[PDB]
Amino acid sequence: GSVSRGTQTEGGSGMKQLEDKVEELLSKNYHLENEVARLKKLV
Amino acid sequence: SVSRGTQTEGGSGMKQLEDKVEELLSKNYHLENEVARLKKLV
Amino acid sequence: DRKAVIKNADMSEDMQQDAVDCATQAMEKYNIEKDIAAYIKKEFDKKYNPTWHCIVGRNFGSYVTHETKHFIYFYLGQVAILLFKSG
Amino acid sequence: DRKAVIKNADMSEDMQQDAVDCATQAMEKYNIEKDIAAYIKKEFDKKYNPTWHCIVGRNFGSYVTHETKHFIYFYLGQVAILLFKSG
């Protein structure tokens, strides 16, 4: 038996989703940190 | 007959992102708890 | 978390699941594709006789020749896995 | 922006250059790896007898078995190319 054939990957979809989610988290993060630093000073 | 393997110079930009999200998600949750913990004292 | 999607197969159903299991075991052990790739090729050489080949990755294309009922191409998560017999 | 770098080879020097030429021709014709992959496999099947296999891509790993003096792994630009014989 002898069967010739090819494959191709289709990755790349959902990247902006991630890029945008990182941006979101990075920002939420920095802002959260400042809140901590701000409250630690109080307590 | 010679068995052997290859690997490309690691790696994808998409793994980079996936791994970065994982990292941030985790740092985030932990950062939030710290806030609440101080917000619990206030 | 990384669910199995078969894109193409010319293989028995038993063998198809068995590939999907191997792939899964291999991915618990090794992070590096080259090593996942070897884990599987080796296991199939043992169970089902030589000569198998196996390519694991996310951004590749191929053209190959296989034996009847000895070919699978499937994704375990966002990672593609080509496995087949020739030799 | 697409100079030839051989990472690994067990092949004659003539054949090695000849692969590097094929790869180059294929990439003038086809943008899609699958198709570059087929172009080459086919050409080598013709010139050097079956059975060749060929994987073309950027983010993959492999484990394979080849015939003595019939294996090459090289980059044409930022794209990796595996080509080898096993039948």
Residue numbers in the entry:
A (entry chain D): 130 to 172
B (entry chain C): 131 to 172
C (entry chain A), D (entry chain B): 3 to 89
Which text from the study accompanies this structure?
The LC8 dynein light chain (DYNLL in mammals) is a highly conserved 10 kDa protein that was originally described as a potential cargo binding adapter of both dynein and myosin 5a motor proteins and as an inhibitor of the neuronal NO-synthase enzyme. Subsequent studies demonstrated that it binds to and regulates dozens of other proteins unrelated to the cytoskeletal motors. It is now considered to be a eukaryotic hub protein. Apo- and ligand-bound structures, determined both by X-ray diffraction and NMR spectroscopic studies, revealed that DYNLL forms a homodimer possessing two identical ligand binding sites. In the complexes two 7-residue peptides bind to parallel grooves at the edges of the dimer interface expanding the two central β-sheets.
